[PDB]
Design an enzyme around this catalytic site. Sequence first.
Site, mmCIF file in Angstrom:
data_model
loop_
_atom_site.group_PDB
_atom_site.id
_atom_site.type_symbol
_atom_site.label_atom_id
_atom_site.label_comp_id
_atom_site.label_asym_id
_atom_site.label_seq_id
_atom_site.Cartn_x
_atom_site.Cartn_y
_atom_site.Cartn_z
ATOM 1 N N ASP A 127 -0.136 -5.581 5.578
ATOM 2 C CA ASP A 127 -1.094 -4.758 4.823
ATOM 3 C C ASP A 127 -2.224 -5.531 4.092
ATOM 4 O O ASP A 127 -2.221 -5.576 2.825
ATOM 5 C CB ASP A 127 -0.319 -3.953 3.755
ATOM 6 C CG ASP A 127 -1.142 -2.869 3.156
ATOM 7 O OD1 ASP A 127 -1.957 -2.297 3.914
ATOM 8 O OD2 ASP A 127 -0.972 -2.595 1.947
ATOM 9 N N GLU A 163 -9.453 -1.346 -0.105
ATOM 10 C CA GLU A 163 -8.970 -0.114 0.470
ATOM 11 C C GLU A 163 -8.062 0.526 -0.525
ATOM 12 O O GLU A 163 -8.298 1.635 -0.990
ATOM 13 C CB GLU A 163 -8.185 -0.365 1.761
ATOM 14 C CG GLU A 163 -7.512 0.957 2.434
ATOM 15 C CD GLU A 163 -6.121 1.377 1.908
ATOM 16 O OE1 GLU A 163 -5.757 2.548 2.092
ATOM 17 O OE2 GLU A 163 -5.392 0.536 1.349
ATOM 18 N N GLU A 164 -7.021 -0.211 -0.868
ATOM 19 C CA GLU A 164 -5.959 0.115 -1.792
ATOM 20 C C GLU A 164 -6.496 0.748 -3.063
ATOM 21 O O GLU A 164 -7.575 1.323 -3.080
ATOM 22 C CB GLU A 164 -5.158 -1.181 -2.039
ATOM 23 C CG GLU A 164 -4.583 -1.774 -0.793
ATOM 24 C CD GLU A 164 -3.711 -0.745 -0.094
ATOM 25 O OE1 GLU A 164 -3.453 0.288 -0.738
ATOM 26 O OE2 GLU A 164 -3.322 -0.918 1.080
ATOM 27 N N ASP A 210 -4.232 -1.520 10.787
ATOM 28 C CA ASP A 210 -3.732 -1.500 9.391
ATOM 29 C C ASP A 210 -2.226 -1.291 9.280
ATOM 30 O O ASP A 210 -1.712 -0.247 9.671
ATOM 31 C CB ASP A 210 -4.417 -0.382 8.575
ATOM 32 C CG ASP A 210 -3.891 -0.259 7.178
ATOM 33 O OD1 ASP A 210 -3.448 -1.276 6.650
ATOM 34 O OD2 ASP A 210 -3.963 0.838 6.579
ATOM 35 N N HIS A 292 4.207 -2.375 0.697
ATOM 36 C CA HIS A 292 3.966 -2.681 -0.728
ATOM 37 C C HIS A 292 5.203 -3.207 -1.431
ATOM 38 O O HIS A 292 5.641 -2.653 -2.412
ATOM 39 C CB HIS A 292 3.444 -1.485 -1.470
ATOM 40 C CG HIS A 292 2.108 -1.036 -1.035
ATOM 41 N ND1 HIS A 292 1.555 0.130 -1.504
ATOM 42 C CD2 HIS A 292 1.225 -1.552 -0.158
ATOM 43 C CE1 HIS A 292 0.373 0.305 -0.954
ATOM 44 N NE2 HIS A 292 0.148 -0.705 -0.130
#
Length: 323
Positions: A127, A163-164, A210, A292
């Site tokens: 990620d 992005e996050e 992604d 994550h």
Amino acid sequence: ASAWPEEKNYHQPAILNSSALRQIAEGTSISEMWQNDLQPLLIERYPGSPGSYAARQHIMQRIQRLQADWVLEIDTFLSQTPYGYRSFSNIISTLNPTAKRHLVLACHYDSKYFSHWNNRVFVGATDSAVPCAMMLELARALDKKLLSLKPDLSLQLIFFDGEEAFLHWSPQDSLYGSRHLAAKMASTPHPPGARGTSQLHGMDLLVLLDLIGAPNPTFPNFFPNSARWFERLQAIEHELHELGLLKDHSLEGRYFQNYSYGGVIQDDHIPFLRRGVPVLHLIPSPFPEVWHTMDDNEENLDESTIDNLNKILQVFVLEYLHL
Ligand SMILES: CCCOc1ccc([C@H]2CNC(=O)N2c2ccc3nc[nH]c3c2)cc1
Ligand SMILES: [Zn+2]
């Protein structure tokens, strides 16, 4: 009377022939990438930090080292985040940027901000250092062929920041990169001077990658207006497999799946797609079981998969660009 926008609705693939692939399967070498493309990305790299920058340089050098004639253009901005304004920068890497039509590839080089829990850091392995690094050994592999590019259509590579989300995903604290650009790229007419068309108007296709790097990925076929380009990706897989060019791969345990499903997974394709572009969003569902965590590290990767997923995406584009 803008004809040439109309040219991605219908555009067909230059399908390669039995032993054309059998090179591409040997033109691409994972380890190199993994030593050279990848591992210089596996550091913290959220925005405003040095791991950004450092990530930004290592990407560009590996888009300058190439014989192909890339033009790397930056999109730096400031954009209020839940930690006050800060400085973001998309990477862009277009071949022939006055070419009316670009197949696009994409993938956020930033990485979430995660407290050094148990003294450990979050680098973003699936990620998404893998997509970016997947998006370098393309270039390198297809250096030899992209050089012939010097049916008005080439290539382009983007890399997103934020992005996050810093704290909690939301429409004001997520996809900072994309949101800002997709704005702009609708305002930057194209080609330069076109009085009724914007760069987007040429963005043939937004193949987004992604969350790539773990075994047994599962890629749904999210959209109806890009199935025929999803299917393309299954096909390529099908036969590559039945020729012997893949590595620890089974018909049953295929990657793409023509099973539409529940619904949407919002990502940086969105601001464009919420503006009317075809995406080819390449996001597994289920995500990796690490998504994550401070276990999204390098170990929890799968060589054989990306290698396999490497081969497919280079082929797809070739056929696509007609090369
Ligand atoms: C097995 C893991 C499943 O957890 C999910 C994670 C993300 C999402 C999607 C769906 N809608 C979102 O906004 N998601 C999200 C959140 C954070 C992200 N960081 C990168 N991509 C993200 C997607 C859905 C399930
Ligand atoms: Zn994430």
